[PDB]
Design a protein that fits this description.
CATH superfamily of chain A: 2-enoyl-CoA Hydratase, Chain A, domain 1
Number of helices of chain A: 7
Number of domains of chain A: 1
Chains A and 10 copies: ATP-dependent Clp protease proteolytic subunit
CATH class of chain A: Alpha Beta
Radius of gyration of chain A: 16 Å
Number of strands of chain A: 7
Order of helices and strands of chain A: HEHEHEHEEHHEHE
Distance between the termini of chain A: 30 Å
Structural class of chain A: alpha/beta
Oligomer: part of a larger assembly
Shape of chain A: globular
Largest interface: A-J, 32 and 27 residues
Helix content of chain A: 40-55%
Entry title: Crystal structure of Neisseria meningitidis ClpP protease E31A+E58A activated double mutant
CATH topology of chain A: 2-enoyl-CoA Hydratase, Chain A, domain 1
Largest sheet of chain A: 7 strands, mixed
CATH architecture of chain A: Alpha-Beta Complex
PDB class: hydrolase
Organism of A, B, C, D, E, F: Neisseria meningitidis
Keywords: Serine protease, antibiotic, hydrolase
Chain lengths: 178, 172, 175, 176, 177, 175, 174, 178, 173, 174, 174
């Protein structure tokens, strides 16, 4: 099948929503490629609207844990945890295609309990919000305060804007673009 | 109809869940009875599992606002906002029938910013209800915080000993 | 309407499941009839499979609170809280029609954290104990008899309910 | 309304399924008519497929309890508890219209085996009780009713008369 | 019925969501009471989470159009268009009960069509947002910029906070003004 | 009831979607008020998002048919057929409250191509007819209405006045 | 209520789909008004998209059966059985308001082939019968109605007048 | 299977709605064929009503990024993003079959006004970007594309050719001109 | 699998509704068979009630585009786009089995009037275009096809032959 | 397939809710790896919100039953039975990635007699899990009772200090 | 796949509800393993809440019918027919893991009176039959099983051992 053939070239895809099962499949491929050759770059192609924060963190920590550089490429879009993961590729090896789009924003829950429980989960959500802003600020070499303002609502960026923001390093128009 | 007739004896019922529409109907009857005679007691009979906090507050503030004493009587049960309203009747005129049951507990139910705002509001409500309940029961705020952390069921006697009602009525 | 006319004769009906709304309507009629005449019997006719325990208690406590004797009559059936209320009429004035049926049983839930489940399980067992004690009182029987006889659904004919102490007499006609 | 007006003439209807609400409404009318005049017949018109056994018993016991004779008339059909109630009218005053139909049959309906045992035994008690009462209504042997209610047993007006379930078939008021 | 009786005392209720139906019923009562006596105050009691903006405006404009002063009273809550209408009562006659709650916020849609259509409706929504902030600023005697800042997200106020904000005039515990 | 009472004052309401049922109820009130007094104005209060075109036309033609002037007042909103009817009140007696909103637009909604052709042809006839009638109501060029109804066109009270859709904005009874 | 009040003026409404219950309510009012005064016109106001053919026929036959002239008025629309009933008012007393719309068309709708044959024939009989009656109402040739009802045929008030379906368009009380 | 065999002839299909999954499968095949032979044309056959704009952009940017010319062929229809991708094939190698149909139009689709403003502006950015890119593909004025995409614009194969959207109509294996 | 085996004999099936997926699978097989041997006939067997017009056109244009003659055979039925495709086989090589049935008819299917106008015009163009192409396939007058497709027009195999839609009825070989 | 490949490196995954089916698949892999080589560590990677208590116990008892050390690694999250299983890896070989999250809490969700029986059983489970967790964390039973009364979220460092894991791994260091 | 491989070690799993199809799959594996080697033990691992009584009996009778000893192991839980099957393994070779749970209880289900009588009788026959067979499995009195299955009876591994339902609790190999 085509995706197994591209895995031979060290290409891993994240396509569609980030779930436990789609994130772990990425984690598995990353571990596989490291085992096959710990000294060669991995190319992580991302076309995703985001999804589960903890599922994305499992990918994130695996990216940082393995020895190979994980280069990231945004095709189509990288939004929310998708953009987080894109910004997390090896600095200098984070790319987007020219008509890609990036979007960043604060955490978002959809859809209970006693006030005590709501307090506990609201505090956890705000911890997540602060943690993601600090990590994103480091990825972008920007101030924490910049990320806090810029993620208050949905923030759409062109490839060029994401580059200028520090989220990616280079826009690739073709192979000559390097 | 039977409820209109009992209204002429100054009996008002809260039965079932407290909603905007059931609470306002109570408010309307309270205002009506005050207008009919501002110097005679009102008998507020409560058999309710609770419901909307803001709807209950509309009843609560109306009870305290009008001139007549509002005497409360728990029949069947008064739980959550139901128990709050029972505890809010004119002190000395808060009653339960012998096999009534009372239950008190803490409040129960977008972007992180919005969740923070609503979580804060919910905790304000929790603290406000504990402070008002402590006043109703002549108890320490810390007692109510302790005793509403989870569902706290009380017999009529336990509610009396707690300060939530004044006396248990077997018969007249 | 027919039920308002029978209310003139001091007849109150409980028909179908006991809910907050159906129980409070009974409570309202009981209070109304007491106000109309506190010295005349009320006839509480019961054809019910039961329902909410707290709703039934509101009827129960009102029955005991008002000054008129509340006579009870089982027609069709009085099951669960229905049978509880039947057994609660003024002793000597609790009746059933000859082909009525009675059924008694322990509490039954149709529908959180372990801590919360513990709290509600303890409340349910309190209710179970309380209903058995009150029923034993109504039937002039031992608490232990009611515990054993309500462990599962216990169906009684009119004649068995009389012998149990749940009702006083079976009425076949107006004699 | 038309039904209140016919109640003036001491006509009570049971139409459609017997439920707690429909049965109690009949009970209420029976008690009302007895109070209005305890010495005049009541005419109980039945077009019903049956329904709840306990709800039907509440009607049945009320019919036997009040002072007035309750005359029964089957129009359209009287099936199951409907036929039971028809057969229960004052003997000599149980009628059907010529194209009425009657049907009788045995009772027709989860948890632990213990509970299923309890409810199965109650259902069989009901079955035997209804057969005993029906046999008395029809002046027939218990064993005849057991035999004849094992499955759905449809009867014409003539067959119900010959069975003992009704007394007469009325084509117009001149029959009696 | 009880509400008709209270209408004779010139009490009008808004309870629950503001819809075309519920708003017009209020409008009808306001017009009725003005006709019955154009020189006596009307008491508009509000326990509402809000609802349709255009339906609320029909109430609002009627309140300002009729001759009687419309006094407002918040019981339970007045949120969104509910709070707008509360703030719109005759200045000096806007009240809340002590445990009432007020909430204000910017408009909220729960959009389909062509980009051109989405542009048209997004503009209209932003017009509504500015219009409500300017009217609210006038009701509260506050700067437009204060209302813009304070309605960006859900802003819950106690009765005392609503009084200090300028949204109501007094808190009534019992009749002692 | 309150609406019957306001009908004595010759006030008729259109609230919510225009349907056959809601439109005919308006028609009935208009005919009733004309019969009661053919020489006194009728006050038609409109808070509506629109609805059925044929149902609105039944109101429209009745407004023009009866002897009384029908004055219109927009409260809350008058959109689509709602705005059409508002614009159709007796010229000089068409009003809006200050925060009312008006919206106008072109018509908005299966089988064989032949049938789709027939119904598409009818819809375009309706579109022209409404633009021609609206242009007459607003004393504007047909071409202005064609251009201005191509997509949803929201107007404040003052914009609707300038457009010719209403005559005056009423803040209170001064004005 | 308002409709009872207008019934005193001999105004009867058909609004919305023609069903057994809405048609019989019209029939009842027609019989009532005839009993109240058999010598005064009845004004039958029609705003309807059509509906059940047999329900419409019950109205139709009642219109022709009672002594009073039944004048018809189309407001909003009269489509299908609605237009049939409009065309059926007393000739000379069939009206439409200026922006009314009329639409006419042929009839529009499981088992064994034998049963499908039976019901298909009945439907074609109905189609034939309605075209014949409509042609009489409009003083037109049967063949014109067959041609003109093959698909949905929308008419303005003026087109319905030239077609023969109504007699006069009323703008006002002048 | 048949599609794998046609892939060895360098034929890639886009059939039905453009989704993240269907677009990425195309991207994968394009990358595969480039790897197999970077100097041979790819034949991208399109029968699609359109779909996700970001998913289509991932295909678009990949088409422009790889070394091989991507020739496009419209069979059945190419509507919306389908027509965008058709118009994006290597100029001179964009084809349609004689009874193909093309349709172009502007983009087509909850929360606080602030959020609705953000997403409305992003949608209008997309609308302008697609009109600019389409104008470039068709060698036409931006103002022509704005005018011609305001509502659904259906084109026959010859109309699409005259518009500049395709280069030639192929009736058979003859048909090709310079 | 059986269909792959029959593909070796150059047999392609269209069965059931014509969709983008089912039409493109046919297109793919046609291209495959042309590549395997551009000089041998293809046998296109059709049992279909029709479906998407644009999906059918993709098959149609591919049939005309490839070198091999595409012979068509109607088994069971060829209705709407199914009958269109049957009529489109290489003239002289369009067949039906004796109890096959053919049906032809005109095209059969929300928003602003402007949009409804646009789509109604497109639908009538399609109707026009299909009648013209069908008239050519059948060597008949455009006006005949307009009249004969106004409503559902069912044909036996011999009626379809007489109409010009197929060339011969095959009882056996 | 990729997971079979990683199994050859002795990596077993628990991803998503713990069910009978997902737990037994883990049990099967554990038994398989023990059979393949009883003397080599197994690496149990956990990204799970929890699930069935009895299903988790089947994994737990299998972890303790087989001869190989089962090393655990939390990636993404280990909540409820997920955190229980993480805390149950061979002491000294329990790891989390730096942005992992852990959450622990008490257990979560007929006739009165039956409700009593099941409430009993649930409280037994609650005490048993607190006892076992206290052992895993080398903490007092009373600490676990206090700390699981409501949802208790921990960072990787908090879980380490709590005793739930041994080391946080940033990378292929140590 | 992993389960086929474990089958080669003579391990058979029952996981989740006992249905006709899950029970027959077990029966098939038992017959297969007997054919492969009739003289070697089979290891039947059970993590099940129970299910169909007749489906469980098909497993039960197959266990007793084949020549190999069927050793049973409870992991996670063995409830109702699950516990029945666990108790049915070769005496001396019935095991549970330390945190396994067992539950036993009487039968539980979720027409005309005649038919209800017939099925109620059959259900009570099943109830007595299961109590007799269970009493034999546990070497206990019939009257003990009747008393102890009246309502849901949860047992720890040690309680199940003391009851006679299993022979040994296995931590690791012990």
């Amino acid at each position: 099948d085509i995706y197994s053939r591209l895995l031979k070239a060290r290409i891993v895809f994240l396509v569609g929503p980030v779930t436990d099962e789609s994130a772990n499949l990425v984690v598995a491929q990353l571990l596989f490629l490291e085992s096959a050759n710990p000294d060669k770059d991995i190319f992580f192609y991302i076309n995703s609207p985001g999804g589960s924060v903890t599922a994305g963190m499992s990918i994130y920590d695996t990216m940082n844990f393995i020895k190979p550089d994980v280069s990231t490429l945004c095709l189509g879009q990288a939004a929310s945890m998708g953009a987080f993961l894109l910004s997390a590729g090896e600095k200098g090896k984070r790319f987007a295609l020219p008509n890609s789009r990036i979007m960043i924003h604060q955490p978002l829950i959809s859809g209970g309990g006693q006030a005590s429980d709501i307090e506990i989960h609201a505090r956890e959500l705000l911890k997540i919000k602060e943690k993601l802003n600090r990590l994103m600020a480091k990825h972008c070499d920007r101030d924490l305060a910049d990320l806090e303002r810029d993620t208050d609502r949905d923030n759409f960026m062109s490839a060029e804007e994401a580059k200028e923001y520090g989220l990616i390093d280079q826009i690739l128009e073709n192979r000559a673009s390097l």
